[PDB]
Short mmCIF file of N, CA and C in Angstrom, two decimals:
data_model
loop_
_atom_site.label_atom_id
_atom_site.label_comp_id
_atom_site.label_asym_id
_atom_site.label_seq_id
_atom_site.Cartn_x
_atom_site.Cartn_y
_atom_site.Cartn_z
N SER A 1 2.66 -13.12 -13.69
CA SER A 1 2.11 -11.93 -12.99
C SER A 1 2.97 -11.50 -11.80
N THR A 2 2.71 -10.30 -11.30
CA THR A 2 3.48 -9.74 -10.19
C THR A 2 2.58 -9.11 -9.13
N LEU A 3 2.82 -9.43 -7.87
CA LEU A 3 2.06 -8.83 -6.78
C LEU A 3 3.05 -7.91 -6.05
N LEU A 4 2.85 -6.60 -6.20
CA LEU A 4 3.71 -5.61 -5.58
C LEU A 4 3.18 -5.15 -4.24
N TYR A 5 3.88 -5.51 -3.17
CA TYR A 5 3.47 -5.15 -1.81
C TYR A 5 4.24 -3.91 -1.37
N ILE A 6 3.53 -2.93 -0.82
CA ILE A 6 4.15 -1.68 -0.37
C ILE A 6 3.93 -1.49 1.13
N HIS A 7 5.01 -1.55 1.90
CA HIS A 7 4.91 -1.41 3.35
C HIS A 7 4.78 0.04 3.81
N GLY A 8 4.49 0.24 5.09
CA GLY A 8 4.31 1.58 5.62
C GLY A 8 5.53 2.26 6.22
N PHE A 9 5.30 3.32 7.00
CA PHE A 9 6.36 4.10 7.64
C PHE A 9 7.25 3.26 8.56
N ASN A 10 8.57 3.42 8.41
CA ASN A 10 9.54 2.68 9.20
C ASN A 10 9.30 1.18 9.18
N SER A 11 8.74 0.67 8.09
CA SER A 11 8.47 -0.76 8.00
C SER A 11 9.49 -1.44 7.08
N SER A 12 9.21 -2.67 6.67
CA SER A 12 10.13 -3.42 5.82
C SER A 12 9.46 -4.68 5.28
N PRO A 13 10.17 -5.43 4.41
CA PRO A 13 9.63 -6.66 3.83
C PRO A 13 9.27 -7.71 4.87
N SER A 14 9.70 -7.50 6.11
CA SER A 14 9.41 -8.45 7.17
C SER A 14 8.02 -8.26 7.75
N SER A 15 7.30 -7.26 7.24
CA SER A 15 5.94 -7.00 7.69
C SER A 15 5.18 -8.32 7.72
N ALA A 16 4.41 -8.53 8.78
CA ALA A 16 3.66 -9.77 8.93
C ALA A 16 2.68 -10.03 7.78
N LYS A 17 1.87 -9.04 7.43
CA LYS A 17 0.91 -9.21 6.35
C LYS A 17 1.58 -9.64 5.04
N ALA A 18 2.81 -9.17 4.83
CA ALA A 18 3.54 -9.49 3.60
C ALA A 18 4.13 -10.90 3.59
N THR A 19 4.82 -11.27 4.66
CA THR A 19 5.44 -12.58 4.76
C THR A 19 4.41 -13.71 4.80
N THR A 20 3.31 -13.51 5.52
CA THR A 20 2.28 -14.55 5.57
C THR A 20 1.63 -14.67 4.20
N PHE A 21 1.43 -13.53 3.54
CA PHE A 21 0.83 -13.53 2.21
C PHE A 21 1.75 -14.26 1.24
N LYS A 22 3.04 -13.98 1.34
CA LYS A 22 4.03 -14.60 0.47
C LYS A 22 4.06 -16.13 0.60
N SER A 23 3.96 -16.64 1.83
CA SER A 23 3.97 -18.08 2.05
C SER A 23 2.76 -18.73 1.41
N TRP A 24 1.61 -18.08 1.56
CA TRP A 24 0.36 -18.59 1.00
C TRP A 24 0.45 -18.61 -0.53
N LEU A 25 0.91 -17.49 -1.09
CA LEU A 25 1.04 -17.34 -2.53
C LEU A 25 1.98 -18.40 -3.11
N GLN A 26 2.99 -18.77 -2.33
CA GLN A 26 3.96 -19.78 -2.73
C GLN A 26 3.29 -21.14 -2.92
N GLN A 27 2.41 -21.49 -1.99
CA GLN A 27 1.70 -22.77 -2.08
C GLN A 27 0.62 -22.77 -3.17
N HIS A 28 -0.20 -21.73 -3.20
CA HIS A 28 -1.31 -21.66 -4.14
C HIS A 28 -1.10 -21.03 -5.52
N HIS A 29 -0.12 -20.13 -5.65
CA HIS A 29 0.15 -19.47 -6.93
C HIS A 29 1.64 -19.23 -7.12
N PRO A 30 2.43 -20.31 -7.22
CA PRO A 30 3.88 -20.22 -7.40
C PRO A 30 4.36 -19.36 -8.56
N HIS A 31 3.53 -19.20 -9.58
CA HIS A 31 3.95 -18.40 -10.72
C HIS A 31 3.75 -16.90 -10.53
N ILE A 32 3.12 -16.50 -9.43
CA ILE A 32 2.93 -15.08 -9.14
C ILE A 32 4.16 -14.58 -8.39
N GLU A 33 4.86 -13.61 -8.96
CA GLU A 33 6.04 -13.06 -8.31
C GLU A 33 5.60 -12.08 -7.23
N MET A 34 5.99 -12.34 -5.99
CA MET A 34 5.65 -11.47 -4.87
C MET A 34 6.81 -10.51 -4.64
N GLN A 35 6.65 -9.25 -5.04
CA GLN A 35 7.70 -8.27 -4.85
C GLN A 35 7.43 -7.38 -3.64
N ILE A 36 8.30 -7.46 -2.64
CA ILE A 36 8.15 -6.68 -1.42
C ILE A 36 9.45 -5.92 -1.19
N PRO A 37 9.63 -4.79 -1.89
CA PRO A 37 10.85 -3.99 -1.76
C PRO A 37 11.01 -3.28 -0.42
N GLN A 38 12.26 -3.01 -0.05
CA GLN A 38 12.52 -2.28 1.17
C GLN A 38 12.51 -0.84 0.67
N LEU A 39 11.50 -0.08 1.07
CA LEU A 39 11.39 1.31 0.64
C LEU A 39 12.33 2.22 1.43
N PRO A 40 12.92 3.21 0.75
CA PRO A 40 13.82 4.14 1.44
C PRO A 40 12.91 5.02 2.31
N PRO A 41 13.49 5.80 3.24
CA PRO A 41 12.68 6.66 4.11
C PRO A 41 12.11 7.92 3.45
N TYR A 42 12.69 8.35 2.33
CA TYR A 42 12.23 9.56 1.66
C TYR A 42 11.17 9.28 0.60
N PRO A 43 10.04 10.01 0.68
CA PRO A 43 8.88 9.92 -0.21
C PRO A 43 9.19 9.90 -1.71
N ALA A 44 9.96 10.88 -2.17
CA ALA A 44 10.31 10.96 -3.58
C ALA A 44 11.08 9.72 -4.01
N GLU A 45 12.11 9.35 -3.25
CA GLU A 45 12.91 8.17 -3.58
C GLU A 45 12.03 6.92 -3.60
N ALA A 46 11.20 6.76 -2.57
CA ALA A 46 10.33 5.60 -2.49
C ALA A 46 9.42 5.55 -3.70
N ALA A 47 8.88 6.70 -4.07
CA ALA A 47 7.98 6.78 -5.22
C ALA A 47 8.69 6.41 -6.53
N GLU A 48 9.91 6.91 -6.71
CA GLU A 48 10.65 6.61 -7.93
C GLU A 48 10.99 5.13 -8.02
N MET A 49 11.35 4.53 -6.88
CA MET A 49 11.67 3.11 -6.83
C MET A 49 10.44 2.28 -7.18
N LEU A 50 9.29 2.69 -6.64
CA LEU A 50 8.05 1.98 -6.90
C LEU A 50 7.65 2.12 -8.37
N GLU A 51 7.83 3.31 -8.94
CA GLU A 51 7.49 3.54 -10.35
C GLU A 51 8.37 2.69 -11.26
N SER A 52 9.64 2.56 -10.88
CA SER A 52 10.58 1.77 -11.66
C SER A 52 10.19 0.29 -11.69
N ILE A 53 9.75 -0.23 -10.55
CA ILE A 53 9.34 -1.63 -10.47
C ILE A 53 8.12 -1.82 -11.38
N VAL A 54 7.17 -0.89 -11.29
CA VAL A 54 5.96 -0.94 -12.10
C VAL A 54 6.27 -1.04 -13.60
N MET A 55 7.07 -0.11 -14.10
CA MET A 55 7.39 -0.11 -15.52
C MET A 55 8.21 -1.33 -15.95
N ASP A 56 8.77 -2.05 -14.99
CA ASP A 56 9.52 -3.26 -15.32
C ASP A 56 8.53 -4.41 -15.50
N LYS A 57 7.33 -4.25 -14.97
CA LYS A 57 6.32 -5.30 -15.03
C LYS A 57 4.98 -4.90 -15.64
N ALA A 58 4.83 -3.64 -16.05
CA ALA A 58 3.57 -3.17 -16.61
C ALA A 58 3.12 -3.94 -17.85
N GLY A 59 4.06 -4.61 -18.51
CA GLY A 59 3.72 -5.37 -19.70
C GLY A 59 2.89 -6.59 -19.39
N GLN A 60 3.19 -7.25 -18.27
CA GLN A 60 2.47 -8.43 -17.84
C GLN A 60 1.38 -8.01 -16.85
N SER A 61 0.85 -8.97 -16.10
CA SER A 61 -0.18 -8.65 -15.12
C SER A 61 0.48 -8.22 -13.82
N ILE A 62 0.08 -7.07 -13.29
CA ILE A 62 0.64 -6.60 -12.04
C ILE A 62 -0.44 -5.95 -11.19
N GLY A 63 -0.44 -6.30 -9.91
CA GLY A 63 -1.42 -5.74 -8.99
C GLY A 63 -0.69 -5.29 -7.74
N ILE A 64 -1.29 -4.37 -6.99
CA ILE A 64 -0.62 -3.90 -5.79
C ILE A 64 -1.45 -3.96 -4.51
N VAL A 65 -0.76 -4.18 -3.40
CA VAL A 65 -1.37 -4.20 -2.08
C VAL A 65 -0.52 -3.24 -1.24
N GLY A 66 -1.16 -2.28 -0.59
CA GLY A 66 -0.41 -1.33 0.22
C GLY A 66 -1.08 -1.12 1.56
N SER A 67 -0.31 -1.10 2.64
CA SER A 67 -0.88 -0.92 3.97
C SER A 67 -0.35 0.35 4.64
N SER A 68 -1.21 1.00 5.41
CA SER A 68 -0.86 2.23 6.11
C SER A 68 -0.37 3.25 5.09
N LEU A 69 0.82 3.79 5.31
CA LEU A 69 1.38 4.77 4.38
C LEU A 69 1.55 4.12 3.02
N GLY A 70 1.81 2.81 3.02
CA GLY A 70 1.97 2.08 1.77
C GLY A 70 0.72 2.17 0.92
N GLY A 71 -0.42 2.33 1.59
CA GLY A 71 -1.68 2.44 0.86
C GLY A 71 -1.78 3.76 0.12
N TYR A 72 -1.10 4.79 0.63
CA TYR A 72 -1.10 6.10 -0.01
C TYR A 72 -0.27 5.96 -1.29
N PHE A 73 0.88 5.32 -1.16
CA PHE A 73 1.76 5.09 -2.30
C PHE A 73 1.06 4.22 -3.33
N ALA A 74 0.34 3.21 -2.85
CA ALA A 74 -0.38 2.30 -3.73
C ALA A 74 -1.47 3.04 -4.52
N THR A 75 -2.17 3.96 -3.86
CA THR A 75 -3.23 4.72 -4.52
C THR A 75 -2.65 5.60 -5.62
N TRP A 76 -1.58 6.31 -5.31
CA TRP A 76 -0.91 7.17 -6.27
C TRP A 76 -0.50 6.34 -7.48
N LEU A 77 0.19 5.23 -7.22
CA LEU A 77 0.64 4.34 -8.28
C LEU A 77 -0.53 3.85 -9.11
N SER A 78 -1.55 3.36 -8.43
CA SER A 78 -2.74 2.82 -9.07
C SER A 78 -3.40 3.73 -10.09
N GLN A 79 -3.66 4.97 -9.69
CA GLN A 79 -4.31 5.94 -10.55
C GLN A 79 -3.40 6.45 -11.66
N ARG A 80 -2.16 6.77 -11.30
CA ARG A 80 -1.19 7.28 -12.27
C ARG A 80 -0.92 6.31 -13.42
N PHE A 81 -0.68 5.04 -13.08
CA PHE A 81 -0.38 4.04 -14.08
C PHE A 81 -1.51 3.05 -14.35
N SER A 82 -2.70 3.35 -13.84
CA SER A 82 -3.87 2.49 -14.03
C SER A 82 -3.58 1.03 -13.66
N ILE A 83 -3.24 0.81 -12.40
CA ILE A 83 -2.94 -0.54 -11.92
C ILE A 83 -3.85 -0.88 -10.74
N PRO A 84 -4.42 -2.09 -10.75
CA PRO A 84 -5.32 -2.51 -9.66
C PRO A 84 -4.58 -2.49 -8.33
N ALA A 85 -5.26 -2.06 -7.27
CA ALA A 85 -4.60 -2.02 -5.98
C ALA A 85 -5.56 -2.19 -4.82
N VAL A 86 -5.12 -2.96 -3.82
CA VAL A 86 -5.91 -3.16 -2.63
C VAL A 86 -5.17 -2.38 -1.56
N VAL A 87 -5.86 -1.46 -0.91
CA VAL A 87 -5.25 -0.64 0.13
C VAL A 87 -5.80 -1.02 1.50
N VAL A 88 -4.90 -1.43 2.38
CA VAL A 88 -5.26 -1.87 3.73
C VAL A 88 -5.01 -0.80 4.79
N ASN A 89 -6.10 -0.32 5.40
CA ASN A 89 -6.02 0.74 6.42
C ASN A 89 -5.05 1.80 5.92
N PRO A 90 -5.30 2.34 4.72
CA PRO A 90 -4.47 3.36 4.08
C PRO A 90 -4.53 4.75 4.68
N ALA A 91 -3.40 5.45 4.63
CA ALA A 91 -3.34 6.82 5.11
C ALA A 91 -3.85 7.68 3.96
N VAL A 92 -4.82 8.53 4.25
CA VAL A 92 -5.40 9.41 3.24
C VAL A 92 -4.68 10.77 3.22
N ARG A 93 -4.29 11.25 4.39
CA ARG A 93 -3.57 12.52 4.48
C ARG A 93 -2.33 12.29 5.35
N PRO A 94 -1.41 11.43 4.88
CA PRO A 94 -0.19 11.13 5.62
C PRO A 94 0.68 12.35 5.90
N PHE A 95 0.59 13.36 5.04
CA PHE A 95 1.38 14.57 5.23
C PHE A 95 1.02 15.27 6.54
N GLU A 96 -0.15 14.94 7.09
CA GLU A 96 -0.57 15.55 8.34
C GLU A 96 0.05 14.81 9.52
N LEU A 97 -0.07 13.49 9.54
CA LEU A 97 0.50 12.70 10.64
C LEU A 97 2.02 12.72 10.64
N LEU A 98 2.64 12.71 9.47
CA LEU A 98 4.10 12.72 9.40
C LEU A 98 4.73 14.05 9.80
N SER A 99 3.93 15.12 9.78
CA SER A 99 4.45 16.42 10.18
C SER A 99 4.82 16.37 11.66
N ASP A 100 4.22 15.44 12.39
CA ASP A 100 4.52 15.29 13.81
C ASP A 100 5.71 14.34 13.97
N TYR A 101 6.13 13.72 12.86
CA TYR A 101 7.25 12.78 12.88
C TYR A 101 8.53 13.47 12.40
N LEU A 102 8.48 14.78 12.20
CA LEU A 102 9.65 15.52 11.71
C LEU A 102 10.87 15.48 12.63
N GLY A 103 12.04 15.36 12.02
CA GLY A 103 13.27 15.30 12.79
C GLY A 103 13.97 13.96 12.67
N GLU A 104 14.83 13.68 13.65
CA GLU A 104 15.60 12.44 13.69
C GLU A 104 14.74 11.19 13.80
N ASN A 105 14.96 10.26 12.89
CA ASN A 105 14.21 9.01 12.84
C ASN A 105 15.14 7.87 12.48
N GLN A 106 14.69 6.65 12.73
CA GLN A 106 15.47 5.47 12.38
C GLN A 106 14.57 4.28 12.09
N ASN A 107 14.87 3.57 11.01
CA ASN A 107 14.10 2.40 10.66
C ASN A 107 14.67 1.31 11.57
N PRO A 108 13.87 0.82 12.52
CA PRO A 108 14.28 -0.21 13.47
C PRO A 108 14.67 -1.55 12.84
N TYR A 109 14.24 -1.77 11.60
CA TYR A 109 14.56 -3.02 10.94
C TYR A 109 15.80 -2.97 10.04
N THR A 110 16.04 -1.83 9.41
CA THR A 110 17.21 -1.69 8.54
C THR A 110 18.35 -1.02 9.30
N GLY A 111 18.00 -0.23 10.30
CA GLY A 111 18.99 0.48 11.08
C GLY A 111 19.31 1.83 10.47
N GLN A 112 18.76 2.10 9.29
CA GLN A 112 19.02 3.37 8.62
C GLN A 112 18.50 4.57 9.40
N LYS A 113 19.38 5.53 9.65
CA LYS A 113 19.01 6.74 10.36
C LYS A 113 18.78 7.81 9.31
N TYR A 114 17.76 8.63 9.52
CA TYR A 114 17.45 9.68 8.57
C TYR A 114 16.76 10.83 9.26
N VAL A 115 16.73 11.97 8.59
CA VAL A 115 16.08 13.15 9.15
C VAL A 115 14.89 13.49 8.25
N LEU A 116 13.68 13.30 8.77
CA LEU A 116 12.48 13.60 8.01
C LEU A 116 12.33 15.12 8.00
N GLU A 117 12.31 15.70 6.81
CA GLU A 117 12.21 17.15 6.68
C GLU A 117 10.91 17.62 6.03
N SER A 118 10.67 18.93 6.13
CA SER A 118 9.47 19.53 5.58
C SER A 118 9.32 19.28 4.08
N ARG A 119 10.43 19.35 3.35
CA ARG A 119 10.37 19.12 1.91
C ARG A 119 9.85 17.71 1.64
N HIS A 120 10.21 16.77 2.51
CA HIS A 120 9.74 15.39 2.36
C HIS A 120 8.22 15.37 2.46
N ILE A 121 7.68 16.21 3.33
CA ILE A 121 6.23 16.30 3.52
C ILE A 121 5.61 16.87 2.25
N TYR A 122 6.30 17.84 1.67
CA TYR A 122 5.84 18.47 0.43
C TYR A 122 5.76 17.41 -0.67
N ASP A 123 6.82 16.62 -0.80
CA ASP A 123 6.86 15.57 -1.81
C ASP A 123 5.70 14.60 -1.67
N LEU A 124 5.39 14.22 -0.44
CA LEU A 124 4.30 13.29 -0.19
C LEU A 124 2.98 13.98 -0.52
N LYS A 125 2.86 15.23 -0.10
CA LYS A 125 1.66 16.03 -0.33
C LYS A 125 1.40 16.24 -1.82
N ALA A 126 2.46 16.42 -2.59
CA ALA A 126 2.34 16.64 -4.03
C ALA A 126 1.74 15.45 -4.78
N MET A 127 1.77 14.28 -4.14
CA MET A 127 1.23 13.04 -4.72
C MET A 127 -0.28 12.90 -4.46
N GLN A 128 -0.82 13.77 -3.62
CA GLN A 128 -2.24 13.72 -3.29
C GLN A 128 -3.14 13.79 -4.52
N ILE A 129 -4.11 12.89 -4.57
CA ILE A 129 -5.07 12.85 -5.67
C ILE A 129 -6.43 13.21 -5.10
N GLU A 130 -6.92 14.39 -5.45
CA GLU A 130 -8.20 14.87 -4.95
C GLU A 130 -9.40 14.17 -5.56
N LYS A 131 -9.30 13.80 -6.83
CA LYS A 131 -10.39 13.11 -7.50
C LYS A 131 -9.91 11.84 -8.19
N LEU A 132 -10.41 10.70 -7.72
CA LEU A 132 -10.03 9.41 -8.29
C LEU A 132 -10.58 9.26 -9.71
N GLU A 133 -9.67 9.20 -10.68
CA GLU A 133 -10.05 9.07 -12.08
C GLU A 133 -10.43 7.64 -12.46
N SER A 134 -9.86 6.66 -11.78
CA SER A 134 -10.15 5.26 -12.07
C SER A 134 -10.44 4.46 -10.80
N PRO A 135 -11.56 4.77 -10.12
CA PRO A 135 -11.97 4.10 -8.88
C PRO A 135 -12.18 2.59 -8.94
N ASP A 136 -12.59 2.08 -10.09
CA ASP A 136 -12.81 0.64 -10.24
C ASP A 136 -11.53 -0.15 -10.03
N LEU A 137 -10.40 0.55 -9.99
CA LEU A 137 -9.10 -0.10 -9.80
C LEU A 137 -8.73 -0.27 -8.32
N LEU A 138 -9.46 0.40 -7.43
CA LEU A 138 -9.14 0.33 -6.01
C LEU A 138 -10.13 -0.45 -5.15
N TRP A 139 -9.59 -1.11 -4.13
CA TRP A 139 -10.40 -1.87 -3.19
C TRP A 139 -9.89 -1.55 -1.79
N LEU A 140 -10.75 -0.93 -1.00
CA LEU A 140 -10.40 -0.53 0.36
C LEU A 140 -10.79 -1.58 1.40
N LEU A 141 -9.82 -1.93 2.24
CA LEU A 141 -10.02 -2.86 3.33
C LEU A 141 -9.76 -1.99 4.55
N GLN A 142 -10.76 -1.85 5.43
CA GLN A 142 -10.60 -1.00 6.60
C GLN A 142 -11.28 -1.54 7.86
N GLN A 143 -10.63 -1.34 9.01
CA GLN A 143 -11.20 -1.76 10.28
C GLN A 143 -11.36 -0.48 11.10
N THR A 144 -12.57 -0.26 11.60
CA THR A 144 -12.88 0.94 12.37
C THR A 144 -12.11 0.98 13.69
N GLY A 145 -11.60 -0.17 14.11
CA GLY A 145 -10.86 -0.24 15.36
C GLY A 145 -9.49 0.40 15.27
N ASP A 146 -9.11 0.81 14.06
CA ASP A 146 -7.81 1.44 13.82
C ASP A 146 -7.63 2.66 14.73
N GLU A 147 -6.60 2.63 15.58
CA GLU A 147 -6.33 3.73 16.50
C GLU A 147 -5.24 4.67 16.00
N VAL A 148 -4.70 4.40 14.82
CA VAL A 148 -3.67 5.25 14.26
C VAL A 148 -4.35 6.21 13.29
N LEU A 149 -5.24 5.66 12.46
CA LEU A 149 -5.97 6.46 11.49
C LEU A 149 -7.46 6.42 11.76
N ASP A 150 -8.15 7.50 11.38
CA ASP A 150 -9.59 7.60 11.54
C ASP A 150 -10.24 7.03 10.28
N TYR A 151 -10.93 5.91 10.43
CA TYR A 151 -11.58 5.23 9.31
C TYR A 151 -12.46 6.12 8.43
N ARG A 152 -13.09 7.13 9.03
CA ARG A 152 -13.97 8.04 8.29
C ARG A 152 -13.31 8.60 7.04
N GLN A 153 -12.06 9.02 7.17
CA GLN A 153 -11.34 9.59 6.04
C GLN A 153 -11.25 8.60 4.89
N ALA A 154 -10.87 7.36 5.20
CA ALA A 154 -10.75 6.34 4.16
C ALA A 154 -12.11 6.00 3.53
N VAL A 155 -13.11 5.76 4.37
CA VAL A 155 -14.43 5.42 3.86
C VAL A 155 -14.97 6.50 2.93
N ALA A 156 -14.78 7.76 3.29
CA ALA A 156 -15.27 8.86 2.47
C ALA A 156 -14.44 9.02 1.19
N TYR A 157 -13.12 9.01 1.35
CA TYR A 157 -12.22 9.18 0.21
C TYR A 157 -12.39 8.11 -0.86
N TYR A 158 -12.49 6.85 -0.44
CA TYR A 158 -12.65 5.75 -1.38
C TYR A 158 -14.12 5.40 -1.65
N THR A 159 -15.00 6.37 -1.44
CA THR A 159 -16.44 6.16 -1.65
C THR A 159 -16.80 5.55 -3.01
N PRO A 160 -16.21 6.06 -4.10
CA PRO A 160 -16.55 5.48 -5.41
C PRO A 160 -15.91 4.12 -5.64
N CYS A 161 -15.26 3.58 -4.61
CA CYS A 161 -14.57 2.29 -4.74
C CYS A 161 -15.17 1.16 -3.94
N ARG A 162 -14.81 -0.06 -4.34
CA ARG A 162 -15.26 -1.25 -3.63
C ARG A 162 -14.69 -1.10 -2.22
N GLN A 163 -15.45 -1.52 -1.23
CA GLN A 163 -15.02 -1.40 0.14
C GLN A 163 -15.44 -2.59 0.99
N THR A 164 -14.59 -2.92 1.95
CA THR A 164 -14.87 -3.99 2.89
C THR A 164 -14.49 -3.37 4.23
N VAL A 165 -15.49 -2.90 4.96
CA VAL A 165 -15.28 -2.27 6.26
C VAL A 165 -15.67 -3.22 7.39
N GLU A 166 -14.72 -3.48 8.28
CA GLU A 166 -14.97 -4.35 9.42
C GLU A 166 -14.87 -3.55 10.70
N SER A 167 -15.88 -3.66 11.56
CA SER A 167 -15.84 -2.94 12.82
C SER A 167 -14.85 -3.64 13.75
N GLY A 168 -14.25 -2.87 14.65
CA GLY A 168 -13.26 -3.45 15.56
C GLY A 168 -11.92 -3.59 14.86
N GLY A 169 -11.11 -4.55 15.29
CA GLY A 169 -9.81 -4.75 14.67
C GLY A 169 -8.84 -3.65 15.04
N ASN A 170 -7.81 -3.46 14.23
CA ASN A 170 -6.81 -2.42 14.50
C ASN A 170 -6.07 -1.99 13.24
N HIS A 171 -5.11 -1.09 13.41
CA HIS A 171 -4.33 -0.57 12.30
C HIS A 171 -3.57 -1.67 11.55
N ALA A 172 -3.03 -2.63 12.28
CA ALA A 172 -2.29 -3.74 11.68
C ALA A 172 -3.20 -4.60 10.81
N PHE A 173 -4.50 -4.53 11.10
CA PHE A 173 -5.53 -5.29 10.39
C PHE A 173 -5.53 -6.75 10.83
N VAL A 174 -6.49 -7.10 11.67
CA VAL A 174 -6.61 -8.46 12.18
C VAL A 174 -7.27 -9.37 11.16
N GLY A 175 -6.73 -10.58 11.02
CA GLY A 175 -7.28 -11.55 10.08
C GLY A 175 -7.10 -11.20 8.62
N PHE A 176 -5.94 -10.66 8.26
CA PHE A 176 -5.67 -10.30 6.87
C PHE A 176 -5.66 -11.55 5.98
N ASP A 177 -5.24 -12.68 6.53
CA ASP A 177 -5.18 -13.93 5.77
C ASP A 177 -6.48 -14.32 5.06
N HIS A 178 -7.62 -13.91 5.63
CA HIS A 178 -8.90 -14.25 5.02
C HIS A 178 -9.03 -13.68 3.61
N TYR A 179 -8.33 -12.58 3.36
CA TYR A 179 -8.41 -11.89 2.08
C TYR A 179 -7.38 -12.28 1.01
N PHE A 180 -6.49 -13.22 1.34
CA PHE A 180 -5.46 -13.63 0.39
C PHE A 180 -6.00 -13.96 -1.00
N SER A 181 -6.93 -14.92 -1.05
CA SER A 181 -7.52 -15.35 -2.31
C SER A 181 -8.38 -14.25 -2.94
N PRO A 182 -9.20 -13.55 -2.14
CA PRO A 182 -10.04 -12.49 -2.71
C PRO A 182 -9.17 -11.42 -3.39
N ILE A 183 -8.03 -11.13 -2.79
CA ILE A 183 -7.09 -10.14 -3.31
C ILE A 183 -6.48 -10.57 -4.65
N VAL A 184 -6.02 -11.81 -4.74
CA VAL A 184 -5.44 -12.31 -5.98
C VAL A 184 -6.49 -12.19 -7.09
N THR A 185 -7.73 -12.55 -6.76
CA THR A 185 -8.79 -12.47 -7.75
C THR A 185 -9.12 -11.02 -8.11
N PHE A 186 -9.18 -10.13 -7.12
CA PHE A 186 -9.47 -8.73 -7.42
C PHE A 186 -8.40 -8.12 -8.32
N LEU A 187 -7.14 -8.41 -8.02
CA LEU A 187 -6.03 -7.87 -8.80
C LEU A 187 -5.90 -8.53 -10.18
N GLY A 188 -6.67 -9.59 -10.40
CA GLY A 188 -6.62 -10.29 -11.68
C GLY A 188 -5.25 -10.89 -11.95
N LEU A 189 -4.60 -11.41 -10.91
CA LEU A 189 -3.27 -11.99 -11.05
C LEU A 189 -3.26 -13.47 -11.37
N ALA A 190 -4.44 -14.09 -11.33
CA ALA A 190 -4.55 -15.51 -11.65
C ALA A 190 -5.62 -15.67 -12.72
N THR A 191 -5.52 -16.74 -13.51
CA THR A 191 -6.51 -16.97 -14.54
C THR A 191 -6.77 -18.46 -14.74
N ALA A 192 -7.96 -18.78 -15.22
CA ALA A 192 -8.34 -20.17 -15.45
C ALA A 192 -8.57 -20.42 -16.94
N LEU A 193 -8.40 -19.38 -17.75
CA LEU A 193 -8.61 -19.50 -19.19
C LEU A 193 -7.76 -20.59 -19.82
N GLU A 194 -6.74 -21.05 -19.11
CA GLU A 194 -5.87 -22.10 -19.64
C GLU A 194 -6.16 -23.47 -19.04
N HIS A 195 -7.16 -23.55 -18.16
CA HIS A 195 -7.52 -24.80 -17.51
C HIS A 195 -8.14 -25.81 -18.47
#
């Protein structure tokens, strides 16, 4: 099986939630491949790279976890290719917040400098899914303490989906480790049929 982790804006595989998850997965589920790609800064490119990884593993068991903007990408991927996904404090309308991020930018971890343009916003916006066709595939993890995103949008948008809403906390999501095992089970990446 494969666990595809999708990081957020100006982030990278060094994301805390990803590295801690990877260490845990290594001890408890060594046969689960943890894929945490470094996403390019452009929406279309990031989407194509993510789609390519999916089709390389769609034959076997594959599940996705996406945080912040990564949750938007995860949702798109999930519904389009019918893949289970857990979205952590996901951006529902990232095209709105990123419009304020237009212009010169730099990924502090890769050092890559880029210019976020309006067309990039269009590309992200074009991925918007107004009606979830396969809600049973999504699981929303959200903390109302998030000061980057307004939890209301996520709670309403993922209404037909399983949800775990915690009051307090923050955008980074405090205590993500508690969900490691629940996530593997939700994504159906482990099995006991061979025990």
